Structure 1
Amino acid sequence: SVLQVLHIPDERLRKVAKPVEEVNAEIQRIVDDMFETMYAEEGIGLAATQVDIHQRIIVIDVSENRDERLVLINPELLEKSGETGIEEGCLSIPEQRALVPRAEKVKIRALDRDGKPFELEADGLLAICIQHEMDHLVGKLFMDYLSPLKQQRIRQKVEKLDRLKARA
């Protein structure tokens, strides 16, 4: 099932997620529907909290033909180094992109879809993507990194967009 993605300025985007207590079949259905929603919305990553589920689950897939789907449950940042930034988009901030400071490399520890633990050293797009999604889980958005004026300037935009969007 395709889940509905919340947009700013929805207050539920600012909720802190709780860790997953047990990775079971309800968890695994959330994963499936999250992947479905991400692909439908043409993203390369989705955090559970953008879909009003306030648990620590992230799905990513950067692959061309769904060969390499990635699942981080209860993710934890072990180390980072460097600094970079591309012009990020966010499914919850529709059509708005900004360059954002990130660590260039990142080492994490998480659980997979089966609740088995793994480690992952990432760089490039993957590293930036992990940070972006992990931010979602503590209620941070990429626009939080920008100046009051850019944020202000941004917010105006999106509300109009959706104000078109329901359209009716």
Structure 2
Amino acid sequence: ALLPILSFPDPRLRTIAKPVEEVTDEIRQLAADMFETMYAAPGIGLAASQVDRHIQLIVMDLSESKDEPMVFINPKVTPLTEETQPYEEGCLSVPQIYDKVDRPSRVKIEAINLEGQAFEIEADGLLAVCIQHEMDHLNGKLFVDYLSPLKRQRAREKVEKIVRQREREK
């Protein structure tokens, strides 16, 4: 029913994504499938890389109500400061694993929407954390890449256990 989400340490999460050529109806369908996949997990962000579609497409909904969807296509993210903010990040590609990452606390985001319109907004708080995390997917990076290698290894062993249990539950 929903799109399959790749799991760390799958090497395909390391693929650097290509920009989207045109916002065709097939990329519109992929976005809507991504949203369903993301809302089901549940999560608040998903990059197309995570469903094994190596294109510069991110879906996101930061709302409690699951009713403020956002799309970023071909995004450029630029820090507006060297101040970082800590945040406890998770990731549907590192299921049930959470730890602290310090990222620039304010960023400019420029991207296009599902109608092919360009936009530029500035973000802080949870938006800046999540857009940087999702941009990182697009460049083949996971939030575990910023943890010590014993946190990484333990994350990996734990995730392989979770994935096996999820297969078994099937």
- TM-score bracket relative to the smaller structure: over 0.9
Tell whether the 8 Å contact from 2:46 to 2:58 is kept in structure 1 after alignment.
yes
Moved more, 83-92 or 158-167: 158-167
- Cα distance, 1:165 vs structure 2: 2.5
Tell whether the 8 Å contact from 2:79 to 2:104 is kept in structure 1 after alignment.
no
Aligned length: 168
Structure 1 residues 53-64: aligned runs within 5 Å = 53-64=53-64
Task: State the alpha-carbon separation in 2 of the partners of residues 27 and 156 from structure 1.
Answer: 34
The match for 2:166 is 165
Q: How high is the sequence identity, in percent, across the aligned residues?
A: 58
The match for 1:49 is 49
TM-score normalized by structure 1? 0.95
Moved more, 90-99 or 147-156: 147-156
The match for 2:77 is 77
- Cα distance, 1:163 vs structure 2: 2.1
1:3 aligns with 2:22: no
Superposition RMSD in Å: 1.3
The match for 2:152 is 151
Letter of the aligned partner of 2:7 in structure 1?
Answer: H
Runs ≥4 in structure 1, deviation > 6 angstroms? none
1:125 aligns with 2:126: yes
Seen in structure 2, the aligned counterparts of structure 1 residues 94 and 115 have a Cα distance that, compared at 3 Å, is same
Structure 2: gaps of 5 or more residues: none
Task: State the alpha-carbon separation in 2 of the partners of residues 106 and 160 from structure 1.
Answer: 36
Deviations 1:130-152 (A, max 9, x none): 00000000100000001112112
Structure 1 residues 5-24: aligned runs within 5 Å = 5-24=5-24
Structure 1: gaps of 5 or more residues: none
TM-score normalized by structure 2? 0.94
